[PDB]
């Protein structure tokens, strides 16, 4: 009764070492289909899924250490990446050349996330705050503050007006961009969070903590609608479908499952990687999945609409 | 597709209903396929099915039957089978009245005692069309070994006009006489 | 209560006796649990055939119970543990198409039983049939078709 | 990571919390069970008998106005009637493999013959609710006998 | 839009209706459709237990219906749907409904109005009355009767009155009887009459049974009537016949929830074995309240029995169906729905405690405390107080824990022990000792006596007074059988002292007759520490190697071997690297420590490899930094890795890389240290080492000014410590002596004095001798090197 | 998929290719006249042969199509070959039966 799932392409060795993050953006109004991936290197290679296969397009690099998160924007041609190098240099994605460089160390940024309108590029600091920079306009207009611990995941509701932040030790903080005042703090899990995502229409917040469970909270109150437990090790990323019916979760047990939120059950599991899977995303009208893994590979799946 | 309605194409063989799916998706628009586990696009207008599934969604409502126009029974000469012939007769009875039927066949003799059954089981008139003389006719040869190195002689015992040739057969057996498993 | 008290990696091998449609035989290198589950299945089939033939039906108990033809029990039990395909190919003398067809026809029943175990009210068969199915289909046995996508 | 001796001292003599004395166990607490079977009673509501159907000018039809009329094919459901007038179904649902649902008419069968022409509007039949009470379920052999209970309004 | 609404797809219908509304505003059917769609969405929300969402939707639906009713107020269906919307909010836990009704609905047209529950239901009754007035049909009559029933139910359930709602119930029966007599061929009316007739306030059971039987006869496909008969018989102690009725009901509709719940209740009553599974199935179907409470109760009861954890009941069910999290979610929904029942709160607290969600458990117990004050005042309230105080003490807020423990009779062992531990946590050690003594008074189960004695030793020790601790632990040792707890504390006490003579005896005693301990890691740590005390420093690694040989599993042992080889006898670098890698392989959650230790071991090794990528020190330390970016060691390791990589690349002579990041890493190290609980000496050493390495790196790269300012800022904090001043000397004297220059004896003497200040450090001496060599004092440099060699050897 | 583009030249197919696909080819060559259906090792019946023979001609890419029988073991035995190569295919039965 489920759909027809299966692989479409398999890149053999994209990078030379582990791949730590991936971002899929169909940014331009025409048919662009650009995939930006970053690894345990300086390389931020920019692939393009053209017709049936991935063709390498850019091999741009300016970093000193491994990149821990990369990001792309849907409006402009642009990308941003941060690393352990204490730099958030953001590339151009058109000429393959650096645009800017912001100095910020592991006490000022861990992971990137652009704005819905591609203007602000919020990142999570060490002392608990969330620092919001300004793209194309300088540095550090303001930082929202939650009195907590190291902060790992940063998400935006894809209509504005909401910002979420998971932390080491579990607690979850939801801010509203309108006033910057903490609405309410969920207590969530007992181990680090390291992934969060809203859903399209921004009324359902899906976490994925370090112990294996996947809470499905609900925004504008603190109601939770259930716990999805089907993994056997850490969960490292969660990407939510364009239509509010499925989401994909990649764990450290070498398997990328795809859940559905209606009945809180797992439809299909992919057993194709051979080591930890550090990144999964959908594409535009969600019908394909990217999964970059610790072993140097880029898998592209086929999830029919 | 012109009238906005829906049509269900049903073929008996599980492996035959895949290349039909590909060619019907290539020829025009949306064509869903349904099988034991696959559910490719269960929203299209040319759902391709195995009869054991249509018999399973006729017993319940399934809310697709509200929109049918044609049911294209593809190879209807599998009724003579002993282990699956009951499916075609569980299906041909339960079809509601507004659903027209198209029955492709393979030139059986008693086509008028079958279309009469379906014509008066429902209450609609059914038209029987039967043909002969397939295009690009075929010559049935007979190959008997001789001089396996290069020489190959083929005897014609049936031709493009259906006339049986006994002369060729006698020639073949006589040819075999003169000479008188894996290595041969 | 036959199936409820077994491992999820054993119920697939017990249900493999209904599907293989291949020349059948018993086994030697089988655990005790499988060799007794086979007895349970055969006893239930004998009971059904005995109530069938005592009513007026004409199908002798041996003819009904002979449809149960084990002989892929060892291959399915080894397949739903982590054994790669090559060792399965070596294991026994059946063409590797008649094995993949049997496994494909088993993963569609260990998922239609998930639909009935939720209906009877057996929430312990559901948590075993949703494991024996997700543990059975991973590789070229279930490789997607070419002229489908 | 720090050297062994101070690590061990922290591990054991930091506080008495680590003792099995202060754990989640070692209390053996109890709770009381309180069933409440009256909650199971379910009351369903009746459907709405009106639709605001449009009007149509008899010639060169245009919607003059919307007039409310009475629906006619309510009290008909997907699991107790077989015709093309029943409500569609529960929701988006599995295509097949659904017991408790009725197939449509098999085409050679119509099976409708009744008139029942009363058509009244004040048809109150004067039912007696306390004279002779029916006390046998359909299918059982005996029901249950409850004791009888002893001991017409207006508003604007 | 209407066609899309029929088939579900409510969001698309709403969007289409809004598009129509933007152009034209008076279009009545579009408003009616919007109202119906919002009402249906509200009902779908109430099918789950998201009550707030439902209240919001119904508020919006009322907005649309009043807007439509302003234009054409002669149609009946609009009034009926308005009444439906308002009265579908029964059983929604009042103090959660504040509905902003506005305009025509409340008669005169003034502003806005906020309605509570009863007022909303009364408005519902009024609206149904108005709808019925202008079109007299059966459905509205039955709905009006149900509305009156709901109103009476709400009034009684809030205890606001009794026997003053009689007229309301009489009116409801009148309406329902009118509806049924109007058309006596519909199961809905008979079923509604049956349910109302058997309400606790009326109690006319004969009519209820008659009504249900008539309903069944009217339409044979009726699960609702059969399950209602089952409930009627079951509550009147007729379990058998009710069981039959329930079985029939589920036979007609296998996925109706109430019948399954009734089956579970009957199974529980007659004491079967598959009641827990039946409740689990009910939980999986659709989240009703009664099944929810039943399942939570059964999970908690199963957890209590401690003879279970091999049964395949506990193991499979609890630990492989994730019963505990499901129970927690179920209880959260139940508790927010009902919220006037204490055992639900206590069960929620218990389950949260097993999930280590301590903050939420504290909240649950707090609410339970509030509920239970003025009803019982017996042991239950005291037990709730002790639990809340204990848990509060578990996570900070010690003063609140002490305050909570004040408000209880301190007469049972549990309360006194909780008070004592809270007091110990805050300070006040004498008070803790007194409390523990009082708890010692009332003691059974001599195991607990031994534990209390060990706690006494531990708590009084922190005051000093070690001798009494030692003798008291011996007093505990004199008990019949050792406890494996006092012996460990005795060894740790010996290690806190020196001259580990009693420590050896304690370790031998522990090994001798105690085998039921199943950690196998603490024992190895104690043995290794004992060997380290005597300064042996090579046996330690040998002993841990023996322990890992004994039990080749247990990753923890492999990791500890790697750490010890890194710390003591750092000449087996290759073995340490292999041990760390093996520890990392055999699991995943030991990633952090094993990766850190293997990175440090690779640093110690040098470059004795095949010049292979993807396995140098930098790669592994980066991997560890990604795993847990919380500890302060990984960042210092990162700085060391960068410096070593720079030197190695310089030797290979291709390019120096990773030039200027030291200051950021130092800031990260200090910030991470700030949140560490207590390893005071270790933290001080780590911060000092990071400072030294950063200054040296900055000097090497060439950023003299930043090093100078950093040193000055650090020195401005505190009076001089002879280490940092040497660093400032180094930064000062780097420009000069770089270019050849002659220096005056005053500067040389001051530098000599500064090195002499902080002795016992071979680096500093070697660097000064290098200074001598640079200016040129050969024999003197030889003397300085000789002193350094002697110091290193000693 | 490699036979529908003419990149393979000889197919050693069996009956499952005779039913499950169409993929016409130019010249069909048989290998025997009798098959083993129900343990009676029967003679090939007239209705079947027509299907395999039918997938012999191609459409407009050749004048005709040649079906080559390959009798090798013994004489062709023209008597039953007559009824095999021509004959009314089969009547139309009805296998109705009751299932649970």
UniProtKB/Swiss-Prot annotation, chain A:
Question: Where is this chain primarily localised?
Answer: nucleus
Instruction: Spell out which residues are annotated as carrying N-acetylthreonine.
Output: 2
Q: What residue ranges carry the coiled-coil annotation?
A: none
Localization (cell): Nucleus; Cytoplasm
Which GO terms fall under biological process for this protein?
Answer: negative regulation of myeloid cell differentiation; nuclear-transcribed mRNA catabolic process, 3'-5' exonucleolytic nonsense-mediated decay; rescue of stalled ribosome; transcription elongation by RNA polymerase II; Wnt signaling pathway
What InterPro entries has UniProt attached to this entry?
A: G-protein_beta_WD-40_rep, SKI8, WD40/YVTN_repeat-like_dom_sf, WD40_repeat_CS, WD40_repeat_dom_sf, WD40_rpt
Q: Which UniProt keywords apply?
A: Acetylation, Cytoplasm, Nucleus, Repeat, Transcription, Transcription regulation, WD repeat, Wnt signaling pathway
The record ties this protein, via Pfam families, to: WD40
Residues with the modification N-acetylmethionine, per the entry, are: 1
Keyword field contains Nucleus: yes
WD-type repeats, residues: 14-57, 62-101, 104-143, 146-187, 188-227, 230-269, 272-305
UniProt key word DNA repair: no
Q: Name one GO cellular component term.
A: Cdc73/Paf1 complex
- Top-level division of the source organism's lineage: Eukaryota
The record describes the protein's role as:
Component of the PAF1 complex (PAF1C) which has multiple functions during transcription by RNA polymerase II and is implicated in regulation of development and maintenance of embryonic stem cell pluripotency. PAF1C associates with RNA polymerase II through interaction with POLR2A CTD non-phosphorylated and 'Ser-2'- and 'Ser-5'-phosphorylated forms and is involved in transcriptional elongation, acting both independently and synergistically with TCEA1 and in cooperation with the DSIF complex and HTATSF1. PAF1C is required for transcription of Hox and Wnt target genes.
Name the protein family.
Answer: Belongs to the SKI8 family.
Q: Which PANTHER family match?
A: SUPERKILLER COMPLEX PROTEIN 8, WD REPEAT-CONTAINING PROTEIN 61
Q: What would be the name of the gene that encodes this protein?
A: SKIC8
Swiss-Prot record, chain B:
Stretches assigned to the Helicase ATP-binding domain: 1-126
The superkingdom of the source organism is Eukaryota
Q: Which family does the record claim for this protein?
A: Belongs to the helicase family. SKI2 subfamily.
User: What is this protein called in UniProt?
Assistant: Superkiller complex protein 2
Q: Where is this motif: DEVH box?
A: 74-77
Which organism's genome codes for this protein?
A: Homo sapiens (Human)
Localization, UniProt: Nucleus; Cytoplasm
The associated disease is: Trichohepatoenteric syndrome 2: A syndrome characterized by intrauterine growth retardation, severe diarrhea in infancy requiring total parenteral nutrition, facial dysmorphism, immunodeficiency, and hair abnormalities, mostly trichorrhexis nodosa. Hepatic involvement contributes to the poor prognosis of affected patients.
Subunit and partners: Component of the SKI complex which consists of SKIC2, SKIC3 and SKIC8. Interacts with HBS1L isoform 2.
**Biological role stated in the UniProt entry:** Helicase component of the SKI complex, a multiprotein complex that assists the RNA-degrading exosome during the mRNA decay and quality-control pathways. The SKI complex catalyzes mRNA extraction from 80S ribosomal complexes in the 3'-5' direction and channels mRNA to the cytosolic exosome for degradation. SKI-mediated extraction of mRNA from stalled ribosomes allow binding of the Pelota-HBS1L complex and subsequent ribosome disassembly by ABCE1 for ribosome recycling. In the nucleus, the SKI complex associates with transcriptionally active genes in a manner dependent on PAF1 complex (PAF1C).
Curated annotation (Swiss-Prot), chain E:
- Give the function comment from the record: Component of the SKI complex, a multiprotein complex that assists the RNA-degrading exosome during the mRNA decay and quality-control pathways. The SKI complex catalyzes mRNA extraction from 80S ribosomal complexes in the 3'-5' direction and channels mRNA to the cytosolic exosome for degradation. SKI-mediated extraction of mRNA from stalled ribosomes allow binding of the Pelota-HBS1L complex and subsequent ribosome disassembly by ABCE1 for ribosome recycling. In the nucleus, the SKI complex associates with transcriptionally active genes in a manner dependent on PAF1 complex (PAF1C).
- Give disulfide pairs as residue numbers: none
Q: Which residues form a coiled coil?
A: none
Q: Name one GO cellular component term.
A: cytosol
Q: Which tissues does the record link to its expression?
A: Widely expressed with the highest levels observed in vascular tissues, lymph node, pituitary, lung and intestine. Not expressed in the liver.
Q: Where are the TPR repeats?
A: 1-27, 41-75, 152-186, 188-222, 223-256, 342-375, 382-416, 418-446, 688-721, 762-794
Stated name of the protein = Superkiller complex protein 3
- Disease named in the record: Trichohepatoenteric syndrome 1: A syndrome characterized by intrauterine growth retardation, severe diarrhea in infancy requiring total parenteral nutrition, facial dysmorphism, immunodeficiency, and hair abnormalities, mostly trichorrhexis nodosa. Hepatic involvement contributes to the poor prognosis of affected patients.
Keywords, comma-separated and alphabetical: Acetylation, Cytoplasm, Nucleus, Repeat, TPR repeat
> What domain of life does the UniProt record list for this protein's source?
Eukaryota
UniProt main location, coarse: cytoplasm
Swiss-Prot record, chain F:
Gene behind the chain = SKIC2
Family assignment from sequence similarity: Belongs to the helicase family. SKI2 subfamily.
Q: Which residues of the full protein are shown?
A: 649 to 748 of 1246
User: Which illness does the annotation name?
Assistant: Trichohepatoenteric syndrome 2: A syndrome characterized by intrauterine growth retardation, severe diarrhea in infancy requiring total parenteral nutrition, facial dysmorphism, immunodeficiency, and hair abnormalities, mostly trichorrhexis nodosa. Hepatic involvement contributes to the poor prognosis of affected patients.
Q: What is this protein called?
A: Superkiller complex protein 2
Superkingdom of origin:
Eukaryota
Summary of subunit composition and partner proteins: Component of the SKI complex which consists of SKIC2, SKIC3 and SKIC8. Interacts with HBS1L isoform 2.
Query: Where is it localised?
Result: Nucleus; Cytoplasm
Species in which this protein is naturally found? Homo sapiens
Its biological purpose is as follows: Helicase component of the SKI complex, a multiprotein complex that assists the RNA-degrading exosome during the mRNA decay and quality-control pathways. The SKI complex catalyzes mRNA extraction from 80S ribosomal complexes in the 3'-5' direction and channels mRNA to the cytosolic exosome for degradation. SKI-mediated extraction of mRNA from stalled ribosomes allow binding of the Pelota-HBS1L complex and subsequent ribosome disassembly by ABCE1 for ribosome recycling. In the nucleus, the SKI complex associates with transcriptionally active genes in a manner dependent on PAF1 complex (PAF1C).
């Amino acid at each position: 009764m489920t759909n027809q799932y299966g692989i479409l392409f398999k890149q053999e060795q994209a990078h030379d070492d582990a791949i730590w993050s991936v971002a899929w953006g169909t940014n331009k109004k025409e048919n662009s289909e650009t995939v930006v991936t970053g690894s345990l290197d300086d390389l931020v290679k920019v692939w393009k899924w053209r017709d049936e296969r991935l063709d390498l397009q850019w091999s741009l690099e300016g970093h000193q250490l491994g990149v821990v998160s990369v990001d792309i924007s849907h409006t402009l041609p642009i990308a941003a990446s941060s690393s352990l190098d204490a730099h958030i240099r953001l590339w151009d994605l058109e000429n393959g050349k650096q645009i800017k460089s912001i100095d910020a160390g592991p006490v000022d940024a861990w992971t990137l996330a652009f704005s819905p309108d591609s203007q602000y590029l919020a990142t999570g600091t060490h002392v608990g705050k969330v620092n919001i920079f300004g793209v194309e306009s300088g540095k550090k207009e303001y930082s929202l503050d939650t009195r907590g611990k190291f902060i790992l995941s940063i998400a935006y509701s894809p209509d504005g007006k909401y910002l979420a932040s998971g932390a080491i030790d579990g607690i979850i903080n939801i801010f509203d961009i309108a006033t910057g005042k903490l609405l309410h703090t969920l207590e969530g899990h007992a181990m680090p969070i390291r992934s969060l995502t809203f859903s399209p229409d921004s009324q359902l917040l899906v976490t994925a903590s370090d112990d294996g469970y996947i809470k499905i909270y609900d925004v504008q109150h603190a109601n939770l609608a259930g716990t999805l437990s089907g993994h056997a090790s850490w969960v490292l990323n969660v990407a939510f479908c364009p239509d509010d019916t499925h989401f994909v979760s990649s764990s450290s047990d070498k398997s990328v499952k795809v859940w559905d939120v209606g009945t809180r059950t797992c439809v299909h599991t992919f057993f194709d990687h051979q080591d930890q899977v550090w990144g999964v995303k959908y594409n535009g009208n969600g019908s394909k999945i990217v999964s970059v893994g610790d072993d140097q590979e880029i898998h592209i799946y086929d999830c029919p609409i | 597709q012109k009238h906005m309605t829906r049509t269900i194409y049903t073929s008996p063989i599980k492996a035959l209903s895949n290349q039909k799916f590909r060619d019907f998706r290539n020829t025009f628009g949306d064509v869903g396929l349904l099988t034991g586990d696959v559910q490719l696009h269960p929203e299209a207008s040319c759902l391709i099915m195995t009869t054991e599934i249509l018999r399973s969604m006729l017993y319940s409502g399934s809310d697709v039957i509200r929109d049918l126009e044609w049911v294209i029974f593809d190879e209807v000469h599998y009724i003579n089978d002993v282990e699956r012939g009951v499916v075609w007769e569980e299906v041909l009875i339960m079809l509601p009245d507004h659903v027209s039927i198209i029955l492709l066949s393979a030139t059986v003799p008693n086509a008028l005692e079958f279309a009469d059954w379906i014509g008066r089981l429902k209450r609609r008139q059914i038209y029987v069309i039967s043909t002969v003389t397939r295009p690009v006719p075929l010559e049935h040869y007979l190959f008997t070994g001789n001089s396996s190195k290069t020489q190959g002689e083929l005897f014609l015992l049936l031709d493009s006009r259906g006339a049986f040739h006994t002369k060729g057969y006698y020639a073949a057996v006589e040819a075999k006489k003169e000479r008188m498993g894996p290595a041969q | 209560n036959a199936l409820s008290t077994l491992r999820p990696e054993e119920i697939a091998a017990l249900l493999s006796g209904l599907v293989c449609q291949s020349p059948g035989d018993a086994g030697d290198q089988l655990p005790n649990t499988l060799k007794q589950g086979i007895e349970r299945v055969r006893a239930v089939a004998k009971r059904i055939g005995e109530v069938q033939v005592a009513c007026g039906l004409n199908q002798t108990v041996e003819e009904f119970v002979g449809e149960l033809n084990f002989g892929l029990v060892e291959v399915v039990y080894e397949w739903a543990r982590g054994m790669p395909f090559s060792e399965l190919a070596g294991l026994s003398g059946t063409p590797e198409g008649l094995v993949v067809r049997c496994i494909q026809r088993l993963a569609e029943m260990c998922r239609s039983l998930r639909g009935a175990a939720r209906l009877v009210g057996e929430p312990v068969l559901g948590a075993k049939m949703e494991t024996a199915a997700t543990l059975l289909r991973r590789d070229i046995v279930f490789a997607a078709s070419l002229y489908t996508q | 990571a720090p050297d062994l001796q101070q690590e061990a001292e922290q591990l054991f003599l930091s506080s008495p919390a680590w003792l099995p004395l202060h754990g989640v166990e070692h209390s053996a607490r109890k709770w009381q069970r309180k069933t409440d079977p009256w909650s199971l009673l379910a009351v369903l509501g009746a459907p709405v008998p009106s639709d605001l159907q449009a009007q149509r000018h008899p010639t060169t039809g245009q919607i003059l106005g919307y007039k409310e009329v009475l629906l006619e094919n309510t009290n008909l459901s997907a699991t107790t009637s077989l015709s093309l007038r029943r409500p569609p179904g529960p929701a988006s649902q599995s295509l097949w493999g659904n017991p408790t649902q009725y197939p449509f008419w098999p085409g050679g069968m119509d099976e409708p013959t009744i008139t029942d022409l009363n058509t009244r509007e004040e048809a109150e039949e004067e039912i007696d609710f306390e004279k002779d009470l029916l006390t046998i379920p359909p299918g059982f052999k005996k029901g249950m006998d409850f004791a009888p209970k002893d001991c017409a309004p207006g508003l604007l | 839009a209407a066609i899309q609404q029929i088939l579900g797809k409510y969001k698309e219908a709403v969007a289409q209706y809004q598009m129509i509304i933007k152009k034209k505003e008076d279009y009545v059917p579009a408003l009616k459709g919007l109202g119906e769609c919002h009402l249906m969405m509200a009902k779908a929300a109430l099918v789950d237990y998201l009550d707030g969402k439902a209240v919001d939707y119904i508020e919006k639906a009322l907005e649309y219906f009043t807007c439509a009713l302003q234009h054409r107020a002669d149609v009946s269906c609009l009034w009926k749907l308005a009444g439906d919307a308002c009265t579908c909010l029964y059983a929604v836990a009042p103090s959660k409904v504040n509905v902003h009704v506005l305009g025509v609905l409340l008669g005169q047209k003034e502003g806005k109005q906020v309605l509570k529950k009863n007022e909303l239901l009364h408005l519902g009754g009024r609206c149904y009355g108005r709808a019925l007035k202008l079109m007299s049909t059966s459905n509205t009559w039955c709905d009006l009767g149900i509305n009156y029933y709901r109103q009476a139910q709400h009034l009684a359930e809030t205890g606001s009155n009794m026997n003053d709602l009689k007229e309301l119930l009489e009116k409801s029966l009148h309406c329902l009887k009118k509806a049924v007599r109007l058309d006596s061929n519909n199961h809905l009316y008979w079923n509604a009459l049956g349910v109302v007739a058997c309400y606790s306030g009326i109690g006319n059971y004969a009519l209820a049974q008659h009504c249900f039987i008539k309903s069944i006869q009217s339409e044979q496909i009726n699960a609702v009537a059969w399950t209602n008969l089952g409930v009627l018989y079951l509550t009147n102690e007729n379990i058998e016949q009710a069981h039959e009725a329930f079985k029939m009901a589920q036979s007609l509709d296998p996925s109706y929830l109430m019948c399954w719940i009734g089956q579970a209740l009957i199974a529980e009553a007659v004491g079967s074995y598959d009641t827990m599974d039946l409740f689990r199935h009910t939980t999986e179907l659709n989240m009703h309240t009664e099944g929810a409470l039943g399942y939570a109760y059964w999970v908690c009861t199963t957890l209590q029995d401690k003879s279970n954890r091999e049964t395949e009941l506990y193991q499979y069910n609890i630990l492989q169906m994730n019963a505990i999290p499901a129970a927690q979610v179920i209880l959260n929904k139940y508790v927010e729905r009902i919220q006037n029942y204490a055992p639900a709160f206590t069960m929620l607290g218990y389950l949260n405690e097993h999930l280590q969600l301590k903050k939420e458990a504290a909240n649950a117990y707090q609410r339970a405390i509030l509920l239970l004050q003025t009803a019982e005042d017996q042991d239950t309230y005291n037990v709730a107080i002790r639990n809340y105080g204990r848990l509060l003490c578990s996570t900070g807020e010690y003063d609140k824990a002490i305050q909570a423990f004040k408000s209880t009779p301190l007469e049972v062992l549990e309360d006194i022990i909780g008070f004592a531990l809270a007091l110990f946590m805050k300070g006040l050690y004498k008070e803790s000792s007194k409390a523990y003594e009082r708890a010692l008074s009332i003691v059974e189960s001599e195991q607990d006596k031994a534990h209390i004695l060990t706690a006494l030793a531990i708590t009084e020790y922190k005051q000093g007074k070690t001798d009494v601790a030692k003798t008291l632990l011996f007093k505990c040792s004199i008990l019949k059988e050792p406890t494996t707890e006092s012996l460990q504390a005795l060894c740790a006490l010996g290690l806190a002292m020196q001259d580990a003579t009693l420590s050896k005896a304690a370790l031998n005693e522990l090994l001798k007759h105690i085998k039921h301990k199943d950690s196998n890691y603490q024992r190895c740590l104690l043995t290794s520490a004992i060997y380290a005390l005597q300064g042996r420093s090579v046996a330690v690694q040998k002993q841990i190697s023996k322990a890992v040989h004994s039990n080749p599993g247990d990753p923890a042992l492999w990791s500890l071997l790697s750490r010890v080889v890194a710390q003591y006898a750092q000449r087996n670098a290759k073995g340490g690297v292999v041990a760390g890698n093996v520890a990392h392989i055999l699991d995943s959650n030991h990633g952090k420590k094993a990766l850190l230790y293997t990175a440090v071991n690779q640093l110690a090794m040098g470059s004795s490899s095949a010049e292979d990528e993807k396995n140098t020190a930098l790669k592994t330390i980066q991997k560890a930094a990604l795993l847990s970016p919380g500890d302060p060691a990984i960042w210092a390791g990162l700085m060391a890795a960068c410096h070593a990589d720079d030197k190695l690349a310089l030797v290979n002579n291709t390019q120096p890389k990773r030039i200027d990041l030291y200051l950021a890493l130092l800031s990260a190290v200090s910030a991470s240290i700030k949140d560490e609980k207590f390893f005071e000496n270790y933290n001080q050493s780590l911060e000092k080492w990071s400072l030294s390495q950063a200054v040296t790196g900055l000097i090497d790269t060439g950023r003299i000014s930043e090093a100078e300012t950093l040193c000055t800022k650090n020195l401005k904090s505190n009076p001089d410590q002879p280490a940092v001043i040497l660093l400032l000397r180094q930064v000062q004297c780097k420009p000069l002596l770089e270019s050849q220059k002659p220096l005056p004896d005053a500067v040389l003497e001051e530098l000599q004095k500064t090195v002499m200040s902080n002795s016992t450090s071979v680096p500093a001496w070697q660097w000064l001798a290098h200074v001598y060599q640079s200016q040129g004092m050969m024999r003197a440099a030889e003397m300085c090197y000789r002193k350094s060699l002697q110091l290193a050897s000693q | 998929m490699l036979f529908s583009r003419g990149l393979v030249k000889v197919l050693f197919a069996t009956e499952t290719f005779a039913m499950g696909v169409n993929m016409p080819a130019r010249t069909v060559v048989f290998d025997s006249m009798r098959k083993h259906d129900g343990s009676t090792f029967r003679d090939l019946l007239p209705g079947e042969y027509v299907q395999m023979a039918g997938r012999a001609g191609r459409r407009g890419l050749d004048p005709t199509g040649t079906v080559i029988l390959l009798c090798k073991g013994r004489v062709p035995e023209m008597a039953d070959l007559h009824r095999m190569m021509m004959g009314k295919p089969s009547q139309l039965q009805s296998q109705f039966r009751l299932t649970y």
